[PDB]
Amino acid sequence: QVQLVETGGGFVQPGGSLRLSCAASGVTLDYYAIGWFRQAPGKEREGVSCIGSSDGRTYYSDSVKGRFTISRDNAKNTVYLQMNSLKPEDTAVYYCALTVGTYYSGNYHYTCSDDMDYWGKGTQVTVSS
Amino acid sequence: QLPPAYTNSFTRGVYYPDKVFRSSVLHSTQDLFLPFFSNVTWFHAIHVTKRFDNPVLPFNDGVYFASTEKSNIIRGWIFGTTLDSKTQSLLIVNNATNVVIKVCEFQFCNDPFLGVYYHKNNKSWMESEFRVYSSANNCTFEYVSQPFLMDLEGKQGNFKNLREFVFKNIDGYFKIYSKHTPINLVRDLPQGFSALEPLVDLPIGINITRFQTLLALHRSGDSSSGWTAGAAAYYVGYLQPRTFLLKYNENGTITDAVDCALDPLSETKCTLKSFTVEKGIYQTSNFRVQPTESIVRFPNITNLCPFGEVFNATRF
Amino acid sequence: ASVYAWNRKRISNCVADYSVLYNSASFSTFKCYGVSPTKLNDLCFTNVYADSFVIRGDEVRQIAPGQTGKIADYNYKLPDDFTGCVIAWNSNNLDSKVGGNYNYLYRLFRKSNLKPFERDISTEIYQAGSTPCNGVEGFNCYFPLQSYGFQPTNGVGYQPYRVVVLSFELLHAPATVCGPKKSTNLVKNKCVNFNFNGLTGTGVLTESNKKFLPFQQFGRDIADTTDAVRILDITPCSFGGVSVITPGTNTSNQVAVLYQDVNCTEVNVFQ
Ligand SMILES: *[C@@H]1O[C@H](CO)[C@@H](O)[C@H](O)[C@H]1NC(C)=O
Ligand SMILES: *[C@@H]1O[C@H](CO)[C@@H](O)[C@H](O)[C@H]1NC(C)=O
Ligand SMILES: *[C@@H]1O[C@H](CO)[C@@H](O)[C@H](O)[C@H]1NC(C)=O
Ligand SMILES: *[C@@H]1O[C@H](CO)[C@@H](O)[C@H](O)[C@H]1NC(C)=O
Ligand SMILES: *[C@@H]1O[C@H](CO)[C@@H](O)[C@H](O)[C@H]1NC(C)=O
Ligand SMILES: *[C@@H]1O[C@H](CO)[C@@H](O)[C@H](O)[C@H]1NC(C)=O
Ligand SMILES: *[C@@H]1O[C@H](CO)[C@@H](O)[C@H](O)[C@H]1NC(C)=O
Ligand SMILES: *[C@@H]1O[C@H](CO)[C@@H](O)[C@H](O)[C@H]1NC(C)=O
């Protein structure tokens, strides 16, 4: 019954600033990697960020430019992602997804494949002239 | 260095051809037997060089191995084709503790052997060195028998025990046949006839082309020079496919035997299926001439097939 | 061991009873191919290779000859002509940890599919991105190993199944593993069908006076036919001819019957 949800997709002219909330419920895993994957129409399933819950190490793509900040809300079991300087092509519906951690050789790995366990209803972001 | 010595084996090296009981009957069986009165290679072990001879010998169709011992110098055998861990090998040892039969890919050294140390302070002998193999990774067959202890000392005098073995390898089965005998000679081959009872039929299923021998030495300067072999002798002969007429007795033992290819009389006995040949004339076989140097004859005309007319045609 | 590195052990040089193994309520999943459940004891094999691991409930169906899947392609491949079969049973009690990552891992990424019966020890990073990863773990350079997460509350499809696959091999040598072929009771003083160590026949088994040798099993008399066995003598029971003595139908109708060479203490009776 582990549930995930995304909120906060926002529409504005180019260069805006937006907040995305990834709220989970009934998580049964002490450690879990959470990722954000975009999908608008005509736009496939490619990763933008994925984060390890044990310490907060962050993997991110060549399009982060630093405007993608993801904070691990520990108390409210949430991923708080904020993006400024909106990119007109990064417009998409976004899924935030949860995977089990990896404990190999006494160290933790956080892998976020194209298919990542359960997904959640997406939030669409539209930014264009 | 000294050239290998030969010996004339006399009615020696006969094993039970099959498992079936037979009483007061004569059975003519065609098996891999040891020919009567044959040259077997003789290998010594005498302190007097020191005559340390454990060379590599072929394993063509079976091996007869006699051993005249007084101190259990003979230890065992190693079987294989390459003996370099490239192909699976086999090992049998009558160690001072157990009986060991391994079948595995072993990296055999140039001179595999065993050595029992002797201490001058106390009359005790214990196994010291065992240099046969180094590694063993991929293999299946393994066996170590129940532990047991024997003398381990080297007595003075002449040979007193005769250990006879026959090794055969056919249909993936390695059969060892064994026999023990009390003998009181000095330096010879014991006379008389005694059949060799089976010992075990190991289901190995490998190619064995060559084999060696394992001997026990005595130590009491340099490791490569400070060794004494101790007195013993072992006889090696080769088995050939021959037909033997074996006479049993009231019990199941093979009391006597003849070989059909020793002399005309033995062949006649084989034909008559009896040890006693009555006065007369008997057809036994057929003398024939085996032709050699086959010759083929054809007309001598090449006929000048015109390959050149096409290969060299000037303008092409 | 985990599925990515399955442990293989060899069984040989022993007699194997599969009947107890097959009639066991513990083993929920038992599908066998290339072997007969009715005649498994009769069949003999040189070597047995047992590969043991643990997988998910759904992945059990993936482990089958000619079947492809995420686990099958990258962790354990079964040959098309595979001889032997697989055994699976639930082990949710062993993985009783409430929640967390486990050391059990599977190779979710690989460059190409495995050859049959191939093991991949190496766990180097899979360079998914076309851009040179340059040996850096991260995005587009995902770690090939993925954990399982066997929780007790998980559904039946996610419960751990302990899967062991037995492969039977008959090399260029006589087999070393055979069925129990348990012996039945011995019956004598009456001609019966006997099969002693592969020696088949019919006849009366009788107490023996002849003494064999320790290694001797069978026994043959003149003309090379079995007369004793290990010790009992084999004597075929009374067979012969039957003739009818008649005075002629012209003078009478009743007849006498001669059973030749038969001690009729077995079968107006004269010997
Ligand atoms: C066989 O033994 C006899 C023994 O006198 C010997 O003369 C002969 O040379 C031997 N045969 C061979 C081939 O060496
Ligand atoms: C014999 O003496 C040696 C000393 O070289 C010693 O190591 C060994 O234990 C002794 N054995 C016995 C039985 O006294
Ligand atoms: C033994 O040698 C024969 C040579 O014909 C070969 O066919 C066979 O494969 C070999 N077997 C082993 C176990 O080396
Ligand atoms: C062999 O047969 C003889 C009968 O002549 C008998 O005395 C002897 O005991 C038998 N051998 C054995 C080992 O029983
Ligand atoms: C074949 O041999 C015969 C016999 O001497 C000879 O006359 C003839 O010329 C030969 N032919 C050729 C083509 O060598
Ligand atoms: C022409 O070709 C033929 C091939 O049949 C060859 O034998 C011959 O030598 C060639 N000519 C010369 C001059 O080598
Ligand atoms: C028996 O044979 C005699 C010949 O003397 C004949 O007369 C008679 O009819 C025969 N009886 C029967 C029943 O055939
Ligand atoms: C026939 O059998 C009886 C008992 O079964 C025996 O007394 C008799 O001697 C047998 N006949 C012969 C000819 O031995």
Author numbering:
A (entry chain F): 1 to 52, 52A, 53 to 82, 82A, 82B, 82C, 83 to 100, 100A, ...
B (entry chain A): 23 to 70, 76 to 247, 252 to 347
C (entry chain C): 348 to 577, 584 to 620, 641 to 644
What text comes from the article?
Conformational flexibility of the trimeric spike protein allows each of its receptor binding domains (RBDs) to exist in two major configurations: a “down” conformation that is thought to be less accessible to binding of most neutralizing antibodies (NAbs) and an “up” conformation that binds ACE2 and most NAbs to the RBD. Structures show that the nanobodies target two distinct epitopes on the SARS-CoV-2 spike protein.
To further investigate the mechanism of action of the identified neutralizing nanobodies, we used cryo–electron microscopy (cryo-EM) to determine structures of the soluble, trimeric spike complex bound to individual nanobodies. (A and B) VHH E (in green) binds to SARS-CoV-2 in a 3-up conformation in the most abundant complex; the resolution is 3.3 Å [0.143 Fourier shell correlation (FSC)]. The cryo-EM structures of VHH E in complex with the trimeric spike suggested that three RBDs in the up conformation could also be bound by multivalent fusions of VHH E. We thus produced VHH EE and VHH EEE connected by GS-rich linkers of 15–amino acid length and similarly tested their neutralizing activity. When expression was induced in the presence of VHH E, spike-ACE2–mediated fusion was reduced to 50%, consistent with VHH E binding to the ACE2 binding site.
